Design a protein around this nucleic acid. Structure first.
Lengths: 125, 258, 193
RNA sequence: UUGACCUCAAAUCAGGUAGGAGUACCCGCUGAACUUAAGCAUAUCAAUAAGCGGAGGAAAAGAAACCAACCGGGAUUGCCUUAGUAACGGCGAGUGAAGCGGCAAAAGCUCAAAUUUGAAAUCUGGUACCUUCGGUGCCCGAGUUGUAAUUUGGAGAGGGCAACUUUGGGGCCGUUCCUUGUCUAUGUUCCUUGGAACAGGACGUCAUAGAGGGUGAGAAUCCCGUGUGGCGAGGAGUGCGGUUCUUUGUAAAGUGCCUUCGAAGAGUCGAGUUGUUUGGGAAUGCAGCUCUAAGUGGGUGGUAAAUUCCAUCUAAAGCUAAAUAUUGGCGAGAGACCGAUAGCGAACAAGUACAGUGAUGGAAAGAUGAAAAGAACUUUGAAAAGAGAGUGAAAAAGUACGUGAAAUUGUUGAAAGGGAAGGGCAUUUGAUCAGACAUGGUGUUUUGUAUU
RNA sequence: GGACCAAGGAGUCUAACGUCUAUGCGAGUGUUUGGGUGUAAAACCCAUACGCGUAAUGAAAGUGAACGUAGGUUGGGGCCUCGCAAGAGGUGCACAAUCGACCGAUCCUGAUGUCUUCGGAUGGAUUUGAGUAAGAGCAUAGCUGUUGGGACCCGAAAGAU
RNA sequence: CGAAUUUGGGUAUAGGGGCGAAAGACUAAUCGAACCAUCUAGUAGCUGGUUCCUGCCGAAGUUUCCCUCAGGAUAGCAGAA
RNA sequence: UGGAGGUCAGUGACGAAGCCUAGACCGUAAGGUCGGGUCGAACGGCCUCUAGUGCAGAUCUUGGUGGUAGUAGCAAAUAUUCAAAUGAGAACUUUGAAGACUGAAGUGGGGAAAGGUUCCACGUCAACAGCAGUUGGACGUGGGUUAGUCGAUCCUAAGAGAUGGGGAAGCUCCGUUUCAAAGGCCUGAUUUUAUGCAGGCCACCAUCGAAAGGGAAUCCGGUUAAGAUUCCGGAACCUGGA
RNA sequence: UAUCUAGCGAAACCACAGCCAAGGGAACGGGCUUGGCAGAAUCAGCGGGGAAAGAAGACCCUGUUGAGCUUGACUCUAGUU
RNA sequence: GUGGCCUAUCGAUCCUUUAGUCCCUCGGAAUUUGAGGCUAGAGGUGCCAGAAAAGUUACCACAGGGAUAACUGGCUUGUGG
C-alpha cells in the first residue's frame, strides 16, 4: 500500500495522467524488459525502449518473433518492429503495433547516453 | 446549488395548449421553448437537492461504545462465533489464540507469514487471497475496485516491526490493545473476529478493561453486568430445584379428539 | 399553523439561513493543522516552552467567585516583588499585565510564589555561550499548574453561640434595605431641634 | 539702476505614482420588494438582493474614555455556552444580543502635547566613488510656521552611590521549503481454454513493495509505479553552531535616598432636535442642523431629574502577527455522490453552433475492432450500390459501426372477422409442454463377459 | 386529462421539539468546543466547565418543602399464616378516589424584643401554584406527529432592483 | 393627389418615461405601463398529479370559535401502542 | 432498485450483465428461479447499512413514433410549341425555329441601405432548387475588384461632447465659453553662443457630426472569363514644392 | 379548380371507437338494458351527428388574487408656502 | 336582603385611567420627584371571541367554480293555453 500523501491511488487521475502524458514521460512508460541473457550481462531488469533495439516478442499472436525496432510510436503507445507486419489483401505490408511490455530486449542499441544510463541504473557492461 | 437554475425560464401561462411549467425563452436554439426548473424536467433541478448539512457522523455514548467493544472482544473467544463469522480456524488448537512477543518483535513479511502458517492463521490468509473479486457495480470507478474477506486481527502491546511485517500480508489487520476498534473487532456488525493476541496484549487486557480485582484505567468505567447469571437456561429449567416444584406435563403434542 | 398540545417553538429560520450555513467538516483536518502548527512553532523556538507563564487570578462574578483560574499576565507589582523588570520578564517568557492590579494579599503571594518557582525552574541561556539545551518542555501551564487554595481543614470543632445564621442574614438584609430611611430619620431629628 | 519672501502658475523639465481586471472571502455606502402577518399600513423579509466605492493573502479588530459590582477580571479575534435568554414587538406575526465560564491563539506598543539651543544634531535629489534592495566625498534644496535624539500615562522628565549583562555590522560551511532530478525487489516457468492469458491448474519468488494505472480479458511478481532508503543539475538565507575585519576604547539600559514636577488630542465631548438603525426599552449606534464645554476634569455604571460617597477607565491621533473567513485563482488528496435526458450549460472544435438591433438567450452531440487488418479482386449497374470474394474471434462489429428495447413497419407462418376490439367463468377443438417408471425394496433365460 | 412508446418524474433534508419504543448509565447523565494519540477525516484515550436533571413559588423583593412508621380511609396485584375441596386473617409496592400534613403566593391575627419602626414568632382562612410527601433523568437511535425553511411536485394576475 | 403633401438619411426625446391633430394610440408582430437579467423555486385557503404487493382495523360531512361560509382550530368519529 | 460493511475462499470469456421468447416451475401477489436464441466483461444469494429507491395519467419533461395519408394539396402574375445536341436518363440544360410577354414611373441599363463573393471559369449526383434536372445564386477547386482627377478623407447642420469650473456617497451629471494666467508664422538671431532673444501681428475661443448638404482637378477609344471616369493608347486638368 | 394519372407530399385532431328506437342514467348514449337489426373492400359529394376542432369562459360568482383610472377613502410624499 | 318577581338589557389582549396597600423595582449605596409592577374597576370593539379602511373598470388580468347566475334539457304547472 501507499504511505506518502503526494501519491494518488485514484483511478481517474492515474488514467488521465497516462493518457495525457507527454512524449518524454511516454518514453519511460514504454520501457521494455531485457532478455535473461541481457539481464545477466548488464544487471538491468528493464530499460526504456529505443529505435534500433533488437527485440523478441514473448506474448501475443507473434510469440517468438524476432526483429529490430522500426519506430517507437509514443503517440500510439506502441513500437513498430521490422518483419512484424500484416499483409493486407491488396498486397501492401502494414506495420503491426505492440506494447514493449510484451517484448524482451535481446540486443541494445548502445551510445554514450545508453551506456551512462546503464551505469546509472547499476549495470557494468 | 445552482444546478438546474442557470436559466431565465418563465411560464408561458394558459392558452398556449402546453403545460404551465416554466419554459426557456428566445429562439433558434432548440433549447428555446423547452421546459425548465422542475424535477420532472430534463435539465431541471432535482427534487429536494442534496445538501452538505445532512447529518453524516452519528453520536454514540462512550459507555455503549465500550459495551460493544467488550462484547466483540468476548465474542472473539467464542469458538462457534468465529466459525459463523467464517474465519477458517478449524485447524487452530484453541482460541483465544495467544502467541509470544517474538511476534511483536518480528521484522520481515516473509517471517510474519511463516509465523501465521506455524500458528494456524494461514487458512484465513488463503481465504482472503482467494476471495478477491471485482466489485459488483459503479463502485469500481469510485476507487473501490476490488473486495476481499477480512483476515486475522493481530493484536499487540508494543510495536517492534509487527505492524510493518504484517502490513503487506493481505487481509491481516494489526491493532494495539489500547485502541481495539469495534470496526475491526466486529466487521459488518458481525461478532467473532479471529484475533491473534501477543502475550503482552493478553496480559494488558486486564489493565485496559478491568477485572473483579482491578480497575479499568478508563476512569469511571467498569465492565457491564449480565442481565442473566448464566446463558444455560436449559440447564436451569432442567435442574432439580425447579423440576421438583414443576407440575407434571402433557404429551408434547395433543391427540386430536373429535 | 397551530395544532394539538405541543410546546410553542421559536425556530428563527425566516431569513436566507441556507446561505449562512457553516457545517464543520474541517474539524479533524483543522485539529491536524493546529497540531502541525504547534509542532512547527516548537521547532522554530526549539528551546522554548511554547507558551508564556500566566498568573493565578480570581474569577470575577459571584457565580465563579469560588474558582481560581489563569489570568493574562503578572502585575508590575508582582514582577517587582519577584525581582524583575517588566521588559526582562516579557523577554524571558513571563506574561506581564499592566492594567491588572492586586488589591489582594493572598493572590499577591500566590503569584509571587509562581514567579519564584518559574525563575528557579527555568534556565536562561547566555548570549555568547555553548547553549546547553535541557530537553525543552512544551507547556509552562502544564509544569506550573493552577491549584485551588485550600480554604479549610476537613474536620474542626463546632463553635455554636446561638444566632442561627438565618436571623443574621435577615437582619443584614434589613439594615441594607432600611439604612437610607434610618439616615433620613436621624437627619430630620437633628434638623428639627 | 537691484536682490528677497508669500501665494499662484508653466514646461514633451528630472524621477515617480493613480486609474483597469478579478472580486469566493474582507471594509464601507446605498438600498428594495416579493414574502409572513392567513387581509393590511408599523413590523417581517432585511440593516438582505440589486447598485456604488476600496484592499489583501487574509481583511477587519486590536492593547480599554472595556467588562464588572466581584475575594474582582484585563488588547483583539474565533469556537462551545450564555440563549431562543434579558429585552424589542398592531407585546401580534415575529425578532433578540452581552458580561461571566471552558477553550483555540496569544504580543506588544508610538505619535502630539517639553529648549539640543554650546551649535537642524534631520531628510529628498544632482554629481562622483564602491562591497549597489544600498553605503560613503561634495553640492543644491527641504526645513525653525519645526526635521533628529528624548517621554506616551503601564508612565516619564538639568543629578549623584557600595560588588553589577550586553554590544553591533556586509560574507562562508551548514538547522530549514521546493522547480525538483536520479538510483534502489520478486515468473512472464509448464498444462488447459482463448484471437489475445492479464482466466483456471502445478510449482515458485519478493514483500517496510498484495496502492493505483498500462499492457490484445480479474496481472504484487510484464511495464510504470508503490514501500524503504541513498546520491544530486538550483533558489530563499538572524526561529542559529563555528569561521569572518574587528569593537567607531567619553556608544544605550535598573534601585535601599527625591531638590521639582508631570505638558496628555475642541465645532470635540456634552445637550437638544430630526431621520435611520439596534434587543437597548423617557431614545443602542450613526448622520444632518442648533447650541456648545471642562480641568481632581471627562466618559461609563442598560429608567428620565441637585447629591453625603462610590466604582471603573482616560475619548475626540496612530501601528500591530496568530487563532477566524474564503461557491475566485494556483497546487494536491479524497468520496457509502452522478454516471451521457444523470453529473456543471458544456465528458466532444461549449459559452461553441445558432437566435435577438440590443441587453441577453444558448443547445444537440461519448462507445467499430486487440489491431483498419476500413473489404484486394471478379461480376451486374450510368452511378449510388448489389451479388460473390476477402480481413476479422465475431461483418448477428462495415465507418448510416458495442447488445441494439418499445412505440411503429415489411415479409413469411398460424388464426378469427354479418355495425368495433379487448375481458371473466366453464368446456371443447387445434397447437405446444412439464411432471415414478436409472431409484432407501425384492433379485437373475449373461444387453457388448468394484460383478451385467 | 389521456394518439402511442421509451427514459426521467413528485412527503425530502435540516434546526428546535411532542408521544411512543430500543439501548447505555443512572441522582446523575452527555468523550468527539477542545486536548492526547493515531495504521494522517477513522479509531482509541482525557474534565475544572457547560447543557438538562436533582425545588418550588411569586410581578418582584424574597421565602423555600416530615406534628406522624413520609399520615389516615376505600380499593389493590403479589407475598406470608392457613383446615381434605370454603374462604378467613396479616402485609400490602404500582395505581386510582378521598381527608389531611409540609413549601411558595394572597388575605388575615400579630409575641418575646426593639436603630418605636423595625424584625415576624404564634395562630389561621369556602383562596391560590406547572409544587413536597424514599428522586428519574440524561444521552443516542427509530417510526409517527409539529413549526420555520423552495418544504410533496408543477402552476399566477402581480411587486422590486 | 401641389400640399396641415409624400419620402430617404442624419439627429433629439426611454418606461410611471417618451411621444400623441387624442384612438389609451404608438414606443422593434410586445402597451390601460415595453423588453432583458435578477430578487424568484415570489405567494396561492385554488386546479392538476402524487410511482410495489398482501394482511388486519376502519371513518366523516356533525359541535363550538374564527372578516368565519371553497379554509382552519376544537370536540366527536378511526388507527396504533 | 442504485450504492455500503460482512460473508458465500459465491457465478462468469468453457460466456457476466443486458435484451428477445402465446417454453417450464414456484408464490395469493409484489415477484423469484430456470430452458432456448442474441452478446462480450462483469454480476449475484444471505445478514445488515443507506437512499436522488418502484409510474398510466400531472393540457407532465425530453426524445422517438403513428393513424389521419399516398390524403389536403403543389390552381394568382395570359404560354408555350418543333427539331437538333449533350447525356445513362431531357417538359424543364444548350443551340436554332416559331409563338408570345414586359411595352421606356419596363420583366430594360445603373446605383443608395443591406448582403458578402452570391461575380467569373472549370467537373457530376449526396443533399438543396416543395416535379425533374445533364441546369443553378447549390457542391468542390480556383480566378477576380488597379484612381492625384469617382467617393471617403476636409467643412460645418440639427446635434453629440472633453477641458475650466460646479454637483453627486458614487457609477457619474451639468456645462461648451462659461466667476480659467487657455495659442500659432517671417526674417534679424542661423556656429569663438542657441532655436536662447527689448525681433512683429495679434487673439480661431477643443473635438466629433453628411459616401444625398458645401467641395481642387479626366475625357475619348480600346482592352477582361470576370475590373475599369481606376488598366493600355492618345489628349488634358488641379494641388503642393528654391 | 375540384376530378383521374406521374412525381412530390404535410396538418389539425385522436381514451377506445364509430348504425339506430326507447328506457333508465349526472335528468339529451357509440357503448349499458330491451328491442330493431346486422355481410368484404370501397370512390365522389355532403354538412345531420360526433353535445366535432380551435382557447385551463373574456359574461357571472367566489378568492381575505391583482392591475389601469377617480375621489370629501385610509396613510403618506415630491414640490410649494 | 349579595339590585330590580323570573326568563334579555352586553365586551378580550395591548394601551390609557382611577382605587388599594403606600406593598415590590429602577440592578454601585439613595433625600426626593418621575417611571415600572401587584389586586379591582372605567375608557370598546353592535361584523357584539373584539381590522384601522372609498369608489370605478364597457381597457382589463389571474386562480378557480357548473359549490353559482345568463340558453337548451330535467322535475313542477302557480301563471299562461
Amino acid at each position: 500500500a501507499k504511505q506518502s500523501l503526494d501519491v494518488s491511488s485514484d483511478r481517474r487521475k492515474a488514467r488521465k495522467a497516462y493518457f495525457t502524458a507527454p512524449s518524454s514521460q511516454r518514453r519511460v512508460l514504454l520501457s521494455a524488459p531485457l532478455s535473461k541473457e541481457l539481464r545477466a550481462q548488464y544487471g538491468i531488469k528493464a530499460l526504456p525502449i529505443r529505435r534500433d533495439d533488437e527485440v523478441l516478442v514473448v506474448r501475443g499472436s507473434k510469440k517468438g518473433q524476432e526483429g529490430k525496432i522500426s519506430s517507437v510510436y509514443r503517440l500510439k503507445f506502441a513500437v513498430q518492429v521490422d518483419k512484424v507486419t500484416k499483409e493486407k489483401v491488396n498486397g501492401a505490408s502494414v506495420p503491426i503495433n505492440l506494447h514493449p511490455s510484451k517484448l524482451v530486449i535481446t540486443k541494445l542499441h548502445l551510445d554514450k547516453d545508453r551506456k551512462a544510463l546503464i551505469q546509472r541504473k547499476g549495470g557494468k557492461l | 446549488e445552482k444546478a438546474g437554475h442557470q436559466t431565465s425560464a418563465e411560464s408561458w401561462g394558459t392558452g398556449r395548449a402546453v403545460a404551465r411549467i416554466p419554459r426557456v425563452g428566445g429562439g433558434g436554439t432548440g433549447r428555446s421553448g423547452q421546459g425548465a426548473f422542475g424535477n420532472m424536467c430534463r435539465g431541471g433541478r432535482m427534487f429536494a437537492p442534496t445538501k452538505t448539512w445532512r447529518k453524516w457522523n452519528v453520536k454514540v455514548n462512550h459507555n455503549e461504545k465500550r459495551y460493544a467493544t467488550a462484547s466483540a472482544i468476548a465474542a472473539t473467544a467464542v469458538a462457534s462465533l468465529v466459525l459463523a463469522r467464517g474465519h477458517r480456524v478449524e485447524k487452530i488448537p484453541e482460541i483465544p489464540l495467544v502467541v509470544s512477543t517474538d511476534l511483536e518483535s518480528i521484522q520481515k513479511t516473509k517471517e510474519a507469514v511463516a509465523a501465521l502458517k506455524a500458528v494456524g492463521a494461514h487458512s484465513d490468509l488463503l481465504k482472503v487471497l482467494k476471495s478477491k473479486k471485482l466489485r459488483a457495480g459503479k463502485g469500481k470507478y469510485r476507487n473501490r475496485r476490488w473486495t476481499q474477506r477480512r483476515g486475522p486481527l493481530v493484536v499487540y502491546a508494543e510495536d517492534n516491526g509487527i505492524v510493518k511485517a504484517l502490513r503487506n500480508v493481505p487481509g491481516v489487520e494489526t491493532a494495539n490493545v489500547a485502541s481495539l476498534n469495534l470496526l475491526q473487532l466486529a466487521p459488518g456488525a458481525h461478532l467473532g473476529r479471529f484475533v491473534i493476541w501477543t502475550e503482552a496484549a493478553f496480559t494488558k487486557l486486564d489493565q485496559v478493561w478491568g477485572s473483579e480485582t482491578v480497575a479499568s484505567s478508563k476512569v469511571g468505567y467498569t465492565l457491564p453486568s449480565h442481565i442473566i447469571s448464566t446463558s444455560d437456561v436449559t440447564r436451569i429449567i432442567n435442574s432439580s430445584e425447579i423440576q421438583s416444584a414443576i407440575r407434571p406435563a402433557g404429551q408434547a403434542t395433543q391427540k386430536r379428539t373429535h | 399553523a397551530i395544532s394539538k398540545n405541543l410546546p410553542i417553538l421559536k425556530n428563527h429560520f425566516r431569513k436566507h439561513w441556507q446561505e449562512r450555513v457553516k457545517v464543520h467538516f474541517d474539524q479533524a483536518g483543522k485539529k491536524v493543522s493546529r497540531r502541525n502548527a504547534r509542532a512547527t512553532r516548537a521547532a522554530k523556538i526549539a528551546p522554548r516552552p511554547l507558551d508564556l507563564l500566566r498568573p493565578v487570578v480570581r474569577a470575577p462574578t459571584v457565580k465563579y467567585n469560588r474558582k481560581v483560574r489563569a489570568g493574562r499576565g503578572f502585575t508590575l507589582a508582582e514582577v517587582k516583588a519577584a525581582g524583575l523588570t517588566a521588559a526582562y520578564a516579557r523577554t524571558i517568557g513571563i506574561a506581564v499585565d499592566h492594567r491588572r492590579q492586586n488589591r489582594n494579599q493572598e493572590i499577591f503571594d500566590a503569584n509571587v510564589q509562581r514567579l519564584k518557582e518559574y525563575q528557579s525552574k527555568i534556565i536562561v541561556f547566555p548570549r555568547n555561550g555553548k547553549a546547553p539545551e535541557a530537553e525543552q518542555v512544551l507547556s509552562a501551564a502544564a509544569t506550573f499548574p493552577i491549584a485551588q487554595p485550600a480554604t479549610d481543614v476537613e474536620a474542626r470543632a463546632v463553635q455554636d453561640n446561638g444566632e442561627s445564621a438565618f436571623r443574621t442574614l435577615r437582619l443584614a438584609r434589613s439594615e441594607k434595605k432600611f439604612r437610607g430611611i434610618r439616615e433620613k430619620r436621624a437627619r430630620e431629628k437633628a434638623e428639627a431641634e
